[PDB]
Symmetry: D2
């Protein structure tokens, strides 16, 4: 079964199911979708809401009159279907003015325009009920070493995020920001390329509590990193404000496959961690239905995102509730991992002969970890051989 | 010429030139070196000092009597040659007791022993004059998802670093810690896999000012990331306490080539940034002379590390001092990148019609960045076609 | 129940369950195993046989008398258990003499010794019944550009494989060779780094029919490549002589995880292709039980390799037999892919206005491929969610 | 001064300096260039010639009258400047009809159209004097495992290349084909992903001598492979028909940086190998001036490609001519690598006690290779630091 409903909090970008299929080497294979169509179709499939870039909802350069009608129609569709808009973002990467960045463009006039375009869309985002405002600095970075002084560009990035935090708190809005890391593409190398670099950058903003991360499965996998481990560090920091779900087959161009495709075992341990941690934000998909597909295949792929989340939710829950797994976690000492190392304190540790002078290093080294039996019980659960 | 002298602050790990050549698939190809030999040979080549793991200087399991003689001989060599010991570290990865980690081992008795082994070596490090104490958590991580709860392991890592900061401040030592990230190898995935993840982890320690990073060229390149950009963010954070220099050819096993080998253009922009920022710490090489070499080739490779740093220092300096490069940096707007975006403040930006309502996005987009001519002047300087 | 039996032809290298857990950053975590114990324990788990490098079965530098004892004990355990030895290989990578290669070492004396050590073990391999003799040139390659002139090295490599073909045919043996590609590690770059470059090199040997490939999951994945695609080109060339199963998580050091770990979807498409094509060789695991494990963990990981192959075999067979999948395969034109483009010939195609002058490119471009529905049926089958 | 002249045989694709800067995340940043302007500007920089896909020179869907005008203007600019057209290719990847491939599309009608569109441009390529016709199967492959049965697809791919060989021989043309490998992008996995798998596939064509490879720096590097090693195996097979020069920084999207950017040491070892082996084909750049640039930046990046090749040519020739390097090459036994292992034959090697029974493995293992000194001489030559 695995039938989604709005309570599962699945959301999708308008640009996701609306991707026309223009790639590096090829023209569009589908016509543009009206956002009304996307909202209604996604609600029929069991989604909870949608998200948008400014330019997905209001064509760039629209008159105020055109802007009003575009927003009216979108809000009309949301109201007719019950869909929500939990997150919004700004396109600071499609227009050629952003070819060397928005907030870190070397041209100061471009950096000022990037912030004005962002602030205008924050007002709309709050009007539509969004709780999170994402920034993906896809054009911040370089192809060559002389072109961007990174410490200057970090100073300009912090300037822009601190001005946006001044604007949201000056207006009394509750919305918070989430930076979405990516390590490369479309620039040779992008600034804040991973969850760890964005977590560290936030600690240098004037009010760090206003900013978190929106990690994307494929973008951490573009650097060969373990996405569940990155999401564990973002949870430990208290900064998982939103998350973007898709698939990726290793280290290559950003594929944005539907969720569950790409690294299926990493998607299992991701859903295991989100549900064990009680993550209560949107389960947001940032995926591209491949350009081989027509519109029926667009909707099939969006459906598959949700389906695979629900299947993996079932299996991770069954693994953690299985008493033989809980016995194997004890044999692997996962319960000792969760106990403090030295709640007795420093002096007690220094005085504890069991910790050094009388520690039998050979007996401790002979103890197996029993990790392989634990992981085969995990595999059995993912494949439904256990329940 | 490019002849190093002690004032260039080049240092080497005892384990570097002392690597016997045992790899995943092969036996040692060289005999072990006595540390005395390594100190004297490196001083003949122009080094400033050496660094050590506890177990490189004192064989594991040594009696106190053996320990005293090993340290006496080492200090004797340092005193005879003028070499210094700026950094030390603990081996928490070779002995089988550390097969599931030191500070984050699931066995709590192992975590306590890891801290006792570390503290004993901090005392020796300070006796020998070290200013930085590095921790490379090579065994912290996992090969499978059930084996390590990452938020529990981060809690145990923070516990251990905060106990070590209690010990150093309780003893009145000036030494500071530097975490050396690596994304994988020998574990499937290692915790704090990049400079950004370690920078973010330090902000959650009780006294973040006691801890920085020791980034290694090849380990950021193992994740496909831009090492100069990572070092720029560590400088911007005020956390470049030490740095490890080597070469790596892309995304593969840790090669530890001599510095300048692997990605030569990244080593040029690395030395450009270290010298432009005024980095005043050790230029430390963590490299393995390939196992094809005999001892003559060990010393040739160590010499090459220093030589290549000095050549690239020359070329980066010449690039930045060349007036045609300085004119090209202006044509590329590197000087506008260094000016605040909106020192006038938020309200002035919102009221500035030149930033949105009257911004000519098409004229700004038509302006070329002139990056390719700048980067070809950089290439000409690296290859000595310009001066 | 997914219980393996010898009929499933699962085999293991002595070096896999016998890995003592020494890595470049750490000492052994397990004692060495007697090959007789490995043979008995693997037979109890359902395996079909074992494979070996010469130096796994006979310690390097053994006397002839010691050699005969080691072999006699091993053959007695094979006989007692019914286990077979389908494949053998030479260790041309542990001993420091091979630090710059065996067959491509720059020292000519070392190239000659590498061939002598291999021919000695081919004799033993045939005495133990092996059908395939693998070569893994893990020390063939370089860390630096001037160290190895690759055209010269490939001449040397072809000379070595041609001599070995001369030896096996001179002796009347039926054994055939299989080259196992790896892109890097332990050398910076290894020669013949993928199944493609090994297949291309075999076509330049004097008798290409004596040589195939032994592709390993993890090694193609270390170059980011699609392992099922490379095994499809090996099968298409008629060169899949043997296969080496394990798991790897992307582009990094060679992990040698148990089969089914690492890229689980690629493991499912590999088993689908092996059973659809009727591959009849050994299903050989080249894996390392992680060094975190004790001996009970070693046998659990070995059991896991076989269990995972049998689960994935069930799931791929259910996918291909499901009528709704067969309908989706037609909807995606997988049956048109299998029809010749132009059996009518060149002139007929040139004269066919339907292929150019009157071809409606827009109508054909509007046709969806329906690959996502197909793939979600495959995911539902893999996860038992139909 | 490193000033290129037409004698250096540097060529550029019309699509390289003419790239308008549209990427998957962004709109064009430059206007389209008239191919006549490109030919005149490249000749002013010292280039030898240009190359083209059919749809670069003639807009897709042009009338015969428009086609003849586009070609006539182009030929007049070639004539005025002295520029040549050594190579041409077909675009079987932009138009949405090719979304699942050209020669391996699951739709048979699309496979037939792909061959018609290619044969039409082979005619034009020969009229413009091309010697090599490249195929880049950038849409041949898949995102998912059930979408493409790779054995079937390779049968289709062989059928297409055999028909094209039939056409060129039927017409008496001297033009030869070169397959350009790429591992991924725009498809999840592309068939024939490296020089190895393209060389292996050509051996299964009906007349392998008509086909070689056109390896591209960046594409092998997208699989982490050593580009000079792959070009050495292409030369060893006698199949380096053409080469495509650019730069790439590791395993990521295809960057197509100017030549000399990306992996500069591998660029030096590539130029060393091309000039040592006497490669005599075009030195063709397949690069994109980054979209940050205006038209002056486009011509600076094109000039840079040629400048970098000429600097690296100087440096590699100085390395190989330096007596101290030649001495270091001997110290590392590069001259023994070039001597046959066993010209004496199999029986002589079996009877040679120096190769086994009396070989002193420890003495030989103690011999350093001296590769680091060698490599530091190469670095000092590359950087002009001797
Ligand atoms: C929100 C962000 O802009 C969405 C993109 C474009 O898909 C980047 O992942
Ligand atoms: C200091 C650290 O332990 C040194 C290693 C082992 O080379 C890791 O890079
Ligand atoms: C047969 C080959 O030697 C086995 C290894 C050592 O595992 C490499 O794959
Ligand atoms: C000839 C080939 O089509 C050129 C491309 C498009 O740049 C791919 O490398
Ligand atoms: Mg995203
Ligand atoms: Mg290091
Ligand atoms: Mg193997
Ligand atoms: Mg190309
Ligand atoms: Mn993405
Ligand atoms: Mn390293
Ligand atoms: Mn392997
Ligand atoms: Mn390319």
């Amino acid at each position: 079964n695995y039938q989604p409903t709005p309570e599962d909090r699945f959301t999708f970008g308008l640009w996701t199911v609306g991707w026309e299929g223009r790639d590096p080497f090829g023209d569009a294979t589908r016509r543009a979708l009206d956002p009304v169509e996307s909202v209604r179709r996604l609600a029929e499939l069991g989604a909870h809401g949608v998200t948008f870039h400014d330019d997905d909802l209001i064509p760039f350069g629209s008159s105020d009159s055109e802007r009003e009608e575009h927003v009216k129609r979108f809000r009309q569709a949301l109201d007719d279907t019950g869909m929500k808009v939990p997150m919004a973002t700004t396109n600071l990467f499609t227009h050629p003015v952003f070819k060397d960045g928005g907030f870190t463009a070397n041209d100061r006039d471009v950096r000022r325009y990037a912030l004005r375009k962002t602030i205008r869309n924050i007002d709309l985002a709050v009007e539509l009920g969004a709780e999170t405002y994402v920034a993906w600095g896809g054009r911040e970075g370089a192809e060559s070493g002389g072109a961007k002084d990174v410490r200057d560009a970090l100073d300009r990035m912090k300037e822009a995020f601190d001005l946006l935090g001044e604007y949201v708190t000056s207006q009394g809005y509750d919305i918070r920001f989430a930076i979405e890391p990516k390590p490369n593409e479309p620039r040779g190398d992008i600034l804040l390329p991973t969850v760890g670099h964005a977590l560290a950058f936030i600690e240098r903003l004037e009010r760090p509590e206003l900013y978190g991360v929106n990690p994307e499965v494929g973008h951490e996998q573009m650097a060969g990193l373990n996405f569940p481990h990155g999401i564990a560090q973002a949870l430990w920091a208290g900064k998982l404000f939103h998350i973007d779900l898709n698939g990726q087959n290793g280290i290559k161009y950003d594929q944005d496959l539907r969720f569950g495709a790409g690294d299926l075992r990493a998607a299992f341990w991701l859903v295991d961690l989100l549900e064990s941690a009680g993550y209560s934000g949107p389960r947001h998909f940032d995926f591209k239905p491949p350009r081989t597909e027509d519109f029926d295949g667009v909707w099939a792929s969006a459906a598959g995102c949700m389906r695979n989340y629900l299947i993996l939710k079932e299996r991770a829950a069954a693994f953690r509730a299985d008493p033989e797994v809980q016995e194997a976690l004890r044999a692997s000492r996962l319960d000792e991992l969760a106990r403090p190392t030295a709640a007795d304190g420093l002096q007690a540790l220094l005085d504890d002969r069991s910790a050094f002078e009388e520690f039998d290093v050979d007996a401790a080294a002979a103890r197996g970890m029993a990790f392989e039996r634990l992981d085969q019980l995990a595999m059995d659960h993912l494949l439904g051989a256990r329940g």
